[PDB]
Amino acid sequence: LRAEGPASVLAIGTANPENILLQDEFPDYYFRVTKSEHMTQLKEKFRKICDKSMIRKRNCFLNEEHLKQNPRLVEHEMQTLDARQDMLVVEVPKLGKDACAKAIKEWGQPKSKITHLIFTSASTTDMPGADYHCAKLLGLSPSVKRVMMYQLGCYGGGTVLRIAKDIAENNKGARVLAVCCDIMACGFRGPSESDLELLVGQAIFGDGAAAVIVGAEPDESVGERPIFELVSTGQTILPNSEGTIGGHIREAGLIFDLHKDVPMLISNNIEKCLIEAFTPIGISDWNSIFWITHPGGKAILDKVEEKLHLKSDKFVDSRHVLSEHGNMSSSTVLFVMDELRKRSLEEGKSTTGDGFEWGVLFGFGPGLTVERVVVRSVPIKY
Amino acid sequence: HLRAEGPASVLAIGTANPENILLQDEFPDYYFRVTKSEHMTQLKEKFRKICDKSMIRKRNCFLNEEHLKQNPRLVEHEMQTLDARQDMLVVEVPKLGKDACAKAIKEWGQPKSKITHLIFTSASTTDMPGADYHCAKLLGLSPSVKRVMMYQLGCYGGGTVLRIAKDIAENNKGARVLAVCCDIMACGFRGPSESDLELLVGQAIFGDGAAAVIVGAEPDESVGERPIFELVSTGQTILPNSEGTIGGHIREAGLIFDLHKDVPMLISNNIEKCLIEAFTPIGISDWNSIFWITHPGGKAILDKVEEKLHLKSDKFVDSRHVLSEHGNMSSSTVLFVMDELRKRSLEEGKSTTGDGFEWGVLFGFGPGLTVERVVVRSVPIKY
Ligand SMILES: CCCCCCCCCCCCC(=O)SCCNC(=O)CCNC(=O)[C@H](O)C(C)(C)COP(=O)(O)OP(=O)(O)OC[C@H]1O[C@@H](n2cnc3c(N)ncnc32)[C@H](O)[C@@H]1OP(=O)(O)O
């Protein structure tokens, strides 16, 4: 028995740790707790990176008491993976379960109707995985079909939507719980004079989890209503991008590579993704649609906006999420989805997509891989 | 959105294994020599009986004695060696994977440009970009191939990649899914210790290998496509009272795994209820009237399941043969079993790809304790 019509997002939930990192105070915090305050010139460059990041605040699970309890974590490169794993194999499923619960609350259906669980995280790795623990913490059926996807990266938010679409539409009644979660205790480390690449990540990455319920044939009879339709999906590797975005599980924890070319590579290639995605729909004005864009960095948004001459209203939700949360990897793009529909409602727009009918969702991550989802809005009943 | 009509079918199967071979009869001595542990005479005899009862004749292993020479940290029990293992496996895991995909693509006989999705699972490593990215580049797939990277599933992953491919191939007309599993046990090789019988078991049963399948719906005989097994339904479940019995952990010392002795009994004591749920809609109750494609996680698992259900000697022939010639290769093993089942059936002139039976069941078992189940239907072999 296959489902009729397209899969849609029926609910969204998000969660963040309680502890907060004010970006104005982070240079002082970072260089103090890492006992690197003598690197004045480096701290000066780090301060400019933080000030230019357009991040006002992040939530982070790792706090100063964790650092005093294990000073090894504040060093630059030091065998710490066990200590990080010990924390994250617990916290990642926990924070993920927090976001799942809020999404199920909105959804308003028995957890026994959840037939599938998709879980993605780049912050940890274990067997059984975070899908198992999150399922147990939620009290889901022991026969929930799980799709565990460790170490995707920041494109992963588009991935779980792609996976959920085919599952929901091919299985009548299937209701897919897809959650992303990342905790940057996996890659926190101290500064080195030879790494501005490190400092960039230390300034932009924050903690969070985002969960959605995906399903076809929404049942208004019992309180289900979709927010966004998932119309088509794609995934591609950008040319001349090899090595530009990388992340590795090592004895020192998560070690990442981040090339300065990434913003230009995305901007110079993204229009082909739009043509490839919207030519069948007959759309060519990239301002006549709504955008749900992963804010991988201020620069990425700025350059895409520049190359395509996008009105400033398109990345408003991306920038607001980046300001209040930083880059949370795979979850970030679903935070933006949620903000888009909450702002549309609060501003009296006619649809959940800022008043537009058609939209596009993008994730960017290692590859350099681009995840794309053409999405359709729903009218807002007033 | 144009969806496919009819069920998704395995259209091709290819496998690969490292070249260096470990003979089980010599492995107790070889293992305790290279690990500088010949003074553990009572633990070695203990280890010799585990290997004697394992019903494993040989295994394929990428890690050789020269590797242990270059890095002696790999032969100690619990030394920080992850970086050295990863340096090897981020390269070798996709490579061996590509070798198996290449054979599957060969049998399939269709252009690589027709591959629309690539599924890759492996428990031996993790990286970003992952083995899926590199396996696709090694193969020459389209940069727009849709990848599904599933790191650290474990021994049930062979059923998972089938369950994932089923929904993709059926919801997308023309979709051709390349699913591959691959594991290399340099991720978990380590020296012995009198306080870890689980390790000894793992060092005796785990071997290297990769296996890849081409999965699609609406097979096109005009272009040379021939189905092998139809994927009918799928299930995943967590066995009750099974917490912590199968585990694997990426640590500074590499992959550390747990294996509780009760795993055979827990599987055998729960498996029939998996059969009932899977075959009651089809109207089948006799577990000897169907063929089996069973992950040979260990000789004890097959033995106990065989007893509990009174399965006849034909069911586990292919599982035990793969186990004897390759050991436990984790996620790929069950796919090695599928391949031999359809190959032996034609060599023996059986009515179908499933040993003459129409309906069958595929099982993977792993961390959870997780059981992956796939009801499968064979395709007639016409003579
Ligand atoms: C905490 C643990 C983390 C754990 C992670 C969890 C898992 C995730 C795995 C995957 C990880 C891989 C990634 O991480 S994927 C993130 C994608 N996001 C981007 O790719 C950001 C886009 N970029 C921007 O948003 C702006 O660049 C930014 C940073 C706001 C700055 O704002 P600004 O406008 O001022 O730009 P400037 O050029 O002026 O830079 C000012 C100075 O920083 C230097 N600089 C910048 N960029 C650099 C780079 N790339 N390399 C080396 N130097 C770099 C410049 O050279 C200059 O230095 P100088 O010339 O000496 O003065």
Side-chain angles (χ1 to χ4, degrees), chain A residues 3 79-82 85-86 122 125-128 132 136 142-153 162-163 165-167 169-171 233 235-237 242 245-251 366-367 369, chain B residues 1 3 80-83 86-87 123 126-129 133 143-154 163-164 167-168 170-172 234 236-238 246-252 255 367-368 370:
Chain A
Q79 277 120 327
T80 55
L81 177 62
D82 292 357
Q85 288 281 78
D86 289 344
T125 314
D126 202 22
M127 292 189 294
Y132 167 90
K136 184 182 297 193
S143 288
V144 69
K145 302 181 210 189
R146 291 167 283 122
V147 185
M148 183 72 239
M149 314 189 68
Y150 276 121
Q151 272 73 54
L152 293 189
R162 167 160 60 86
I163 303 302
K165 175 180 169 66
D166 285 327
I167 289 163
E169 299 176 349
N170 195 64
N171 294 280
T233 53
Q235 190 204 47
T236 195
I237 305 165
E242 179 160 271
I245 292 181
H248 320 290
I249 308 305
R250 314 286 294 183
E251 300 173 23
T369 303
Chain B
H1 193 27
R3 62 200 174 178
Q80 297 139 93
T81 56
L82 181 63
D83 291 358
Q86 290 280 70
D87 286 336
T126 176
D127 197 46
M128 287 185 288
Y133 165 83
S144 284
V145 64
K146 295 164 182 58
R147 289 164 289 121
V148 185
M149 185 67 239
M150 310 184 75
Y151 277 122
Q152 272 76 43
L153 295 186
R163 168 170 53 95
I164 297 301
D167 293 325
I168 289 169
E170 293 177 4
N171 195 62
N172 300 280
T234 65
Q236 191 195 54
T237 196
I238 298 161
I246 303 181
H249 318 287
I250 296 275
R251 312 287 289 178
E252 297 169 23
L255 181 61
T370 297

Side-chain angles (χ1 to χ4, degrees), chain B residues 62-69 71-77 79-113 115-136 138-193 195-220 222-225 227-242 244-272 274-276 278-287:
Chain B
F62 170 83
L63 193 75
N64 62 42
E65 188 171 348
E66 188 173 5
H67 285 125
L68 313 184
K69 277 148 157 201
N71 189 5
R73 289 165 72 84
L74 292 164
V75 308
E76 297 299 330
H77 179 246
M79 286 205 92
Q80 297 139 93
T81 56
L82 181 63
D83 291 358
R85 303 167 189 275
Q86 290 280 70
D87 286 336
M88 290 166 34
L89 290 162
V90 300
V91 171
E92 302 298 347
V93 165
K95 168 49 162 55
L96 187 66
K98 172 265 271 154
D99 289 336
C101 299
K103 291 166 188 181
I105 295 161
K106 203 182 199 217
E107 171 183 4
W108 188 36
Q110 307 302 302
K112 298 172 169 177
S113 74
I115 296 163
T116 57
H117 304 70
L118 168 62
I119 302 173
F120 199 112
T121 183
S122 175
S124 302
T125 178
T126 176
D127 197 46
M128 287 185 288
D132 60 311
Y133 165 83
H134 290 120
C135 181
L138 296 179
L139 287 169
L141 310 190
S142 158
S144 284
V145 64
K146 295 164 182 58
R147 289 164 289 121
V148 185
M149 185 67 239
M150 310 184 75
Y151 277 122
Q152 272 76 43
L153 295 186
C155 282
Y156 65 78
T160 309
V161 303
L162 294 176
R163 168 170 53 95
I164 297 301
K166 185 183 180 289
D167 293 325
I168 289 169
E170 293 177 4
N171 195 62
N172 300 280
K173 184 186 213 155
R176 288 288 180 271
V177 180
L178 175 59
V180 57
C181 315
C182 169
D183 280 284
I184 293 167
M185 303 304 170
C187 65
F189 178 91
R190 60 183 76 269
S193 180
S195 53
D196 193 357
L197 274 64
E198 286 153 285
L199 179 65
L200 292 184
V201 173
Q203 299 297 138
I205 67 176
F206 288 123
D208 293 2
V213 295
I214 291 274
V215 177
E218 302 183 353
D220 189 326
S222 319
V223 304
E225 292 186 318
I228 308 166
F229 289 107
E230 293 161 47
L231 310 170
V232 171
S233 73
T234 65
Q236 191 195 54
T237 196
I238 298 161
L239 304 187
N241 296 336
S242 69
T245 51
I246 303 181
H249 318 287
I250 296 275
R251 312 287 289 178
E252 297 169 23
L255 181 61
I256 311 302
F257 53 84
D258 314 321
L259 295 171
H260 208 44
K261 65 192 311 310
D262 288 359
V263 166
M265 218 62 241
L266 272 164
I267 291 171
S268 61
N269 282 356
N270 285 278
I271 187 143
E272 179 173 65
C274 294
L275 294 169
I276 295 178
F279 285 107
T280 288
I282 306 283
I284 287 172
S285 48
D286 176 7
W287 315 135

Side-chain angles (χ1 to χ4, degrees), chain A residues 116-135:
Chain A
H116 302 70
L117 172 65
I118 303 177
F119 202 117
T120 186
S121 177
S123 309
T124 179
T125 314
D126 202 22
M127 292 189 294
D131 59 318
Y132 167 90
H133 294 288
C134 182

